[PDB]
Structure formats: structure tokens, C-alpha cells
Amino acid sequence: GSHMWIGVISLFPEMFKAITEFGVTGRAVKHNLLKVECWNPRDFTFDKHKTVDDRPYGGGPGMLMMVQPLRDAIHTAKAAAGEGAKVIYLSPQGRKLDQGGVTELAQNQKLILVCGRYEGIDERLIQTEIDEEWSIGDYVLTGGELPAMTLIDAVARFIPGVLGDGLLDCPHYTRPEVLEGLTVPPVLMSGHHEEIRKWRLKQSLQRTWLRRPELLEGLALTDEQRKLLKEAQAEHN
């Protein structure tokens, strides 16, 4: 319906099986709400040894991706996407991913995700081939594959059919009623819907407050939420 097409440039396309063949993302794929198409720069080399890396100008420890096979793979993917596909490079230098960014990215019907390996890609390719850099967080990984997959899984949740607000989740409980002495909170057994809604909300406000206070600053809380937050805080002191 409002499905999504995602192109992937990667030296390890088979990695993407982790999201295409399992769980919710796997189902989204099989029901054609999500399409993940991979192009491997190795297929675009011409030398006998299928070389995909190259030496950094200026010396240095590592390698970069070799420009020609990487550039060609990107062009082929763009031609498959038609007009309107946004090309994203996953990197530490990129805009930090958060839920607002995920909802932004989900608006696009077509994405091309370029996954860096070695010490990354030539600076000039970013300028000519890439629309936006994104980071999933302030940490270094061996490849852009996992951040690509992470991005894909996150936006996939916003596609209609795939499934069935500033705050951390409340605690959840299932069977049994007593577990290693710990009991389930009586309000959740009471059956009183509205009392349950308020407890969960208070919990979220309390949990957000104690674990991630800065998240509360971005929010314009409701009167109810202000009340429920004030209460939780009173009970804490």
C-alpha cells in the first residue's frame, strides 16, 4: 500500500537476511510491504581479484573502499529506484538517529543505503553521491551494514500493515502472578481500565524522570502528566 523500497550497497548483502527472513521485518518483506534490494560493489569490479579496497592518499593505517566499483554500484541502484530516492550514508559523522529522525526518514518511499567498510568511502563520493549522512549512535562498528539494518527495521515499523510519545515504557507483567516472591501490582489485576491507564502513565513519567531526565525537558507535558509526574516525585522523597 504505502509500501517502502530500500536499496542497499554492501560487500555483505547476505547479512541483510537477518531482517529479510525473520520476525516482523521478514513478514513485511514476504507480504510486499517492504522491499530490500542489494547491490554488491564486488560485482562491479573488473580485475581478476575483484578488488574493492584502495590505498588512502596521504598514507595512514587502513584502506578505503575503491571508488570505481563503489560508484558504479551506487549508480545502478539509483537507476533501479527511479526519481525521488534519497541516498543515505551510515557513519559516525552523520546526523544522530532518534525517533523523530526515523519518522522523518519513513516519509520517503525510496531509500538507498550505502554501507561503508574499511576506513570508509572517499570524501568526494559523499559530496556527489550522498544526500544525507546518518549515525545510529556515538560508537564505532566494523561496517555500515548493522546501522543500515537498524535503520531499515526502525522505519519499517511505520509502514501500514507491518505491526498489528517522548517517554520510557512502563513496567510490563505476565504470568505467573508471583515470581521469586515478586508479585504483580494489584492495579493491573483490578480490571479498572482507567486506573490502569493512569498507573502506566505515572510509571512512564517516573521512569523517564529517574533514568533520562533530559528527555522530560523536550516535552510540553499535559496537566494530567504534570499531576502524575508531581505525584511520583512526591512519593520518591
Ligand X SMILES: NC(=O)c1ccc(NCc2ccccc2N2CCOCC2)nc1
Q: Which residues are annotated as a binding site for S-adenosyl-L-methionine?
A: 89, 116, 136-141
Q: Is 101 in the site for ligand X (CB under 6 A)?
A: no
CB of 193 to a copy of itself, least distance (A): 7
Contact region with a copy of itself (CB under 8 A), list: 31-39, 79-87, 139-147, 222-230: 139-147
CB of 149 to ligand X, least distance (A): 11
Q: How far is CA 52 from CA 10, 11, 35, 119, 204, in A?
A: 11, 8, 26, 12, 48
Contacts of 54 (CB under 8 A, 6+ apart): 63, 64, 65, 66, 67
Pick 32 or 100: Cβ nearer a copy of itself:
100
Q: Residue 188: CA atoms inside 13 Å, Cβ hemisphere, count?
A: 13
Within the chain, where are the H helices?
Answer: 17-20, 23-30, 67-81, 99-106, 123-129, 145-156, 193-211, 213-217, 223-236
Q: Is 141 in the site for ligand X (CB under 6 A)?
A: yes
Q: Is 99 in the site for a copy of itself (CB under 8 A)?
A: yes
- Helices 145-156 and 23-30, packing angle to 10 deg: 70
Cell triple for 23: 520476525
CB of 27 to a copy of itself, least distance (A): 10
The 3-state DSSP class for residue 66 equals coil
Among 91, 204, 206, 208, binds ligand X (CB under 6 A): 91
Contact region with ligand X (CB under 6 A), list: 10-18, 46-54, 76-84, 133-141: 133-141
Pick 13 or 120: Cβ nearer ligand X:
120
Q: Is 90 in the site for ligand X (CB under 6 A)?
A: yes
CB of 17 to ligand X, least distance (A): 19
Q: Is 123 in the site for a copy of itself (CB under 8 A)?
A: yes
Site string for a copy of itself, 192-221 (x = CB under 8 A): -x--x---x------x---x---x------
Cell triple for 48: 581478476
Tell me how crowded residue 200 is: count the other CB atoms within 10 A of its CB: 16
- Helices 145-156 and 99-106, packing angle to 10 deg: 80
Q: Is 115 in the site for a copy of itself (CB under 8 A)?
A: no
Contacts with ligand X by CB under 6 A lie at 90-92, 116, 119-120, 135-137, 139-144, 147
